[PDB]
Amino acid sequence: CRLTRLFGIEFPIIQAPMAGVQGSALAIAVSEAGGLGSLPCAMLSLEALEAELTAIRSQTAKPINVNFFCHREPVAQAAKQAAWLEQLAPYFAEFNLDPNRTPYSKAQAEVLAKFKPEVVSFHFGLPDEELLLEIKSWGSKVISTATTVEEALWLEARGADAIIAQGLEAGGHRGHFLSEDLTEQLGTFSLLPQIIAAVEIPVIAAGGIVDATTVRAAMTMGASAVQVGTAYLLCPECNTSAIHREALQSDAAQHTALTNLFSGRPARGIVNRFMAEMGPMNEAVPDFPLASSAVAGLRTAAERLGFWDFSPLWCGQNASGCRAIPAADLTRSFVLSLP
């Protein structure tokens, strides 16, 4: 296959970079198993970043994927922020709380340059051409997420080596960047074959790929690989919180929705009180990534009391594939139905 050769990996599974639930130990296990392991870097300081890459490199020399956000920083909006804070006042009262990141840059480049990742993935489009040329000159393949056909064509045109097609079924943030209109986005079943028809480069399927059968359906459609997120979230290598783990296993896990309430940007998570009462979508939330600061305390407080009411419970529309077995074992689950 085209991506196994291009990436130098055995199996056409990519473990989805999932910021906040996961680091080196899951990336190591999946790359050692023969797929592509992924380090989410969106929330890492430069110190954490270098540490975590050093930890990866001293347990495997197999390929890995380091992931970054390259969104536009929002624009000052202290008042929009203050108005949102005012709206949450009732929760602050209830929980007795006193209310009292950062796109890929040259700074992250300098650290990456020491390690030279086999792949560099981006969410929310691509960085500037210079940053991109710097990356390519490490030997790194560059991939990014498309949620429409137009986005896929934009990525090809700007030199992406592969496109991640994420259907609406996907957990975590929508990686859209040409349009704010969510009705332009498609489910996996329709996005995948339409992106493959439009581009010449390889296409990775993301959104609802949770098991052998679904991996098979994806490849049948002409995907060169699959990116799998939600179905690793119960693996011991994952740092998924007890309360997030509990939600995934409950029958609430089946009902998810797109919400901007936690971050400023549409993301899919298990439906909770905060989303039901204030959303799921809300036009008053500040631009990404400002909104996190306003719920950080509530989340902490409500989790401490064992409520998942104010948590970002990122999860796709098929939770049925999550299993508490080693991620290497699980990565092999996924490839049984392939030739």
Ligand X SMILES: Cc1cc2nc3c(=O)[nH]c(=O)nc-3n(C[C@H](O)[C@H](O)[C@H](O)COP(=O)(O)O)c2cc1C
Residues in the annotated binding site for FMN: 19, 67, 166, 171, 208, 227, 229-230
- Considering beta carbons, is residue 49 or 88 the nearer one to ligand X? 49
With CB cut-offs between 5 and 8 Å by kind, which of its own copies, ligand X, none does residue 254 bind?
A: its own copies
Contact flag: residue 213 with its own copies (CB under 8 A): yes
Stretch that binds ligand X, among 134-142, 222-230, 288-296, 297-305 (CB under 6 A): 222-230
Angle, CA of 126, 173 and 177, to the nearest 5°: 35
In whole angstroms, what is the distance from residue 176 CA to residue 168 CA? 11
In whole angstroms, what is the distance from residue 279 CA to residue 262 CA? 11
Q: Please report how close the Cβ of residue 194 comes to its own copies at its closest, in angstroms.
A: 6
- Considering beta carbons, is residue 187 or 222 the nearer one to ligand X? 187
Contact flag: residue 120 with ligand X (CB under 6 A): no
- Considering beta carbons, is residue 140 or 318 the nearer one to its own copies? 318
In whole angstroms, what is the distance from residue 201 CA to residue 204 CA? 10
Assign residue 139 a region: left if phi > 0, alpha if psi is -120 to 50, beta otherwise?
Answer: left
Closest residue to ligand X using C-beta atoms: 229
The CA radius of gyration of the chain, in Å to the nearest whole number, is 19
Tell me if 210 sits within 8 A of 232, measured CB to CB. Answer: no
| Other Cβ atoms closer than 10 A to 131 | 19
Q: Please report how close the Cβ of residue 208 comes to its own copies at its closest, in angstroms.
A: 4
Q: Which of 155, 315, 327, 328 binds ligand X (CB under 6 A)?
A: 315
Q: Please report how close the Cβ of residue 214 comes to its own copies at its closest, in angstroms.
A: 6
Q: Please report how close the Cβ of residue 154 comes to ligand X at its closest, in angstroms.
A: 17
Structure tokens that stand for 285 in this block: 């939330």
3-state secondary structure of 226: strand
Ordered DSSP codes for 161-193 = SEEEEE-TT-SEE----S-S-GGG---HHHHHH
- Considering beta carbons, is residue 59 or 241 the nearer one to ligand X? 241
Contact flag: residue 234 with ligand X (CB under 6 A): no
- Considering beta carbons, is residue 169 or 287 the nearer one to its own copies? 169
Assign residue 51 a region: left if phi > 0, alpha if psi is -120 to 50, beta otherwise?
Answer: alpha
Tell me if 126 sits within 8 A of 107, measured CB to CB. Answer: no
With CB cut-offs between 5 and 8 Å by kind, which of its own copies, ligand X, none does residue 105 bind?
A: none
From residue 230 to residue 259, the character string flagging contacts with its own copies as x (rule: CB under 8 A) and all else as - is: ------------------------xxxxx-
For the chain, counts of helices (H) and of strands (E): 14, 11
- Considering beta carbons, is residue 115 or 124 the nearer one to ligand X? 124
In whole angstroms, what is the distance from residue 84 CA to residue 284 CA? 6
Q: Which of 31, 65, 272, 317 binds its own copies (CB under 8 A)?
A: 317
Contact flag: residue 266 with ligand X (CB under 6 A): no
